């Protein structure tokens, strides 16, 4: 039918009274930026808002904020119609009132603090009956138009009168809250949303359809990762989106009742569900009711888990339910519960990376006041390990810490703080500064997953190495159906092998970052590091992950360190277990593996079989033009004077390593660092009785060369160049 | 708000007479080394002590005594007004009585061992209804001043007249004792402490502002370390200096 239906999807620009479409929409029924739209939803509501452009919206598909989306009785993917609406006039008075639960903590004048900044200049389309959301003073509260003078809906011209009459109105049944969880209170984990979005939505949101089909859904979701990712927070979002009943099973507080009680509490969670379906069961620290067959000792507790077990059989019923499940430890879950027709579906919500972090930090600082200094990104970067909870508390503890100096002043009269006291609380940067210095981030011991930084502009020479990386990562990746026609699968790895600091481990790093995807580096030390019974199961954890990461490139960088301690029974096992994971990766899941060696002589022949590391790339010391780039790469960070010469640098330091220069490189700065505190502390004597001197000369060049010395010996370069030669026979005899 | 009112905060000399400010805001109210300054605390209380210069007290606060502390029915982080006295007169007769469960173990010249050295050469300006707390014998009694003949305020010079009907008083329900706990007690471990005194002031002082702001403080406070560092008496001194409810769950 009419080309103004569309279908629902998320919001990008954060704003309330704003809506987007695709260009090629916005022609097709002929509306441009400027005007106003109306929006009719289910349960006969009507919206009205400004609409916008938006280059990533696809045309069949109508982003509008969750305020918008309440509005009008409506979620993602169900149909709204949007028509233009020129006969919008501006309005003589507006009567909005506060909605009681969301302001009885705070106290002042909400027509001063909230509306006033929330409609001066914004020209808001509004309908009556909306309910609008403010956030300020470290609050969001909602106001729900209750008259418009131009009624139904009108502008907000600054012509325009706008009371609120006091004392706040209650919730009406059907209005949900905004202070309730959604996607939008949940960052930086966007692929892992979708699976879970993927496959809840078709059973939960069209309930009828999947009963007709007779084709079987997901019924158990297991959500796992560290402690305080948000699985908590991810179930409670679906299932106030999709609408559906939410039921909550704490782990703890069931195990805290009584025997009987116990097994109790979970049927009657269950058969409310069945009830009131479509409907998602949370189990939430599923490892409390349900661990390992073995610690389970203790016979009450035994029957707590079967009796789960028949409850999950239990969905039989398959009245529109599904019943998710978080825990911390994956493996501390019994087997039994990860059976199919169970908790048959896995998602790994691992740790943000930088990008999403900062995702994060913008989610719980949107209602304080940030001052101008504040650089989140910059925050983002610092908070390396940090979890979402985390952030979430360093950012309350960072608003706690302006508080409290901002409390001083008003300490004088501590009895009366208002809300137009806590929107003109600003909060430093130094603020968040202090606020990670107090944080005890839990997750740095975590295997870090995400896609490098280090790309081809930071390593020097290797050109036509770097091209056969592409031709082994990045194009059967990008040009599969390629492959296909020429009848060719391509090698599962690729095996590094040359003398130290020659860059072996940044290619693994470029290499990702050319194909954009994600990377996991293990380094020899890190897998002797499990205990001699842990590490059977670590190394198929890690398998695992590259899975989940697809496509991604796992490495396993200084395998020296592990044929050393080879030629001992625990380093053994570890490599026959990688080497049986390897057979056990499929070509065709899109996991690349890279190794790495400063000691080709020792490596176990195994590992350079056909499918295996067959790849071998040799990669030596660098030559003269790499020289200039390793030089101009390390020092681009750096301010570095026009006298430098770097050619003549470079032919001086032939047999270098590409290390031994970022050796050079520091030893120099470090002078010229030197230089600079030392010039610092002249300057202040002749104060005492402005034109610092801040750039690296030739003389500190000059002198850290005086000092330099070659990590990598001749006797040691012809080995190697030899190597380079014979280290295919290794599969023979040793050479 | 005039310049008189102040933040409270911890003490620095040991001395219950003594109070701290810094010399920038000694200058602001015209105050030098040696003078008396008038205090004026919560429940519509007086305390009278000799005020100090001290370069680390910031600007806001003022270092005051457990003792000074608790005459003024105060805590920490709280305000007070100071204000120079110079209408202060030596005493003519003074008289203390001591509190009963201080006492009742020693017998004997409480005045000649514990009042006389404690006033000797002392100079000590003392309020009418003030307790003050004097240590010996190892032991630690808690003196109020229930007559001054010069009232309500007067200095104790060596000319001064004490007074002891030696038949102690019973506590007061307000008046909390110096034996409890404080911060006075713990040493070694400031730093931690710190950190323990931020997190707890803005949510157990101010609890108010948790109501309306809408934020999240810390719930859970785990302290941890070998046995005897300080763990449990570091949990009452902070309730106490909080004036918080204490639960103990052993
Ligand atoms: N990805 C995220 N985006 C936004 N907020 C997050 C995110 N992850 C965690 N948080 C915050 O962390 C807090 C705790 O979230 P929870 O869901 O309870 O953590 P968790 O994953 O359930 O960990 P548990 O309790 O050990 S199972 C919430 O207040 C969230 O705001
Ligand atoms: N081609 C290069 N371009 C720029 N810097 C390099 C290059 N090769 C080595 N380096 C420097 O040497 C450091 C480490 O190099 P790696 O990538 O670890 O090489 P490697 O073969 O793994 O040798 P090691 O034993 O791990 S240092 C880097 O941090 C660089 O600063
Ligand atoms: N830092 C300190 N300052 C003053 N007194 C201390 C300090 N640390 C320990 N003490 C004394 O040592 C005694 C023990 O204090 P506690 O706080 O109970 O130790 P603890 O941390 O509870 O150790 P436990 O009983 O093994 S848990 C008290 O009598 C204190 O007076
Ligand atoms: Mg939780
Ligand atoms: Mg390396
Ligand atoms: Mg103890």
Redesign the pocket.
Known sequence: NRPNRLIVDEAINEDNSVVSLSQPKMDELQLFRGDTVLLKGKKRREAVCIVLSDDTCSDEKIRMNRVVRNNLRVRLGDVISIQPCPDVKYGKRIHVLPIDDTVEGITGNLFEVYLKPYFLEAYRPIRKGDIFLVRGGMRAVEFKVVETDPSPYCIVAPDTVIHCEGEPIKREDEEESLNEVGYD?????RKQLAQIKEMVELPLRHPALFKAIGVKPPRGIL?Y????????????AVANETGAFFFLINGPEIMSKLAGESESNLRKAFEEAEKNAPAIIFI??LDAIAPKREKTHGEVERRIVSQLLTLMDGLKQRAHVIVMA???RPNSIDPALRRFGRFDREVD?GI?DAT?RL??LQ??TKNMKLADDVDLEQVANETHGH???????LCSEAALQAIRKKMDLIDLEDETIDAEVMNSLAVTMDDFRWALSQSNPSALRETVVEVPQVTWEDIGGLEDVKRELQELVQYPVEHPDKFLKFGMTPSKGVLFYGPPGCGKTLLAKAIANECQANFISIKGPELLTMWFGESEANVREIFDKARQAAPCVLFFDELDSIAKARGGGAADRVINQILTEMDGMSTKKNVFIIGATNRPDIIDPAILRPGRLDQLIYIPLPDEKSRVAILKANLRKSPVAKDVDLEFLAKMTNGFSGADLTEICQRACKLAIRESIESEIRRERERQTDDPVPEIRRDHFEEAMRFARRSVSDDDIDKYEDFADTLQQSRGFGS
């Open positions: 209170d949940i960052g930086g984990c959500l990762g560290p402690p305080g990712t948000g699985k908590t927070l991810i179930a409670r939430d620290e978080a825990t911390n919500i943000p999403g995702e994060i989610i719980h979890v979402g909870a985390d952030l979430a508390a």
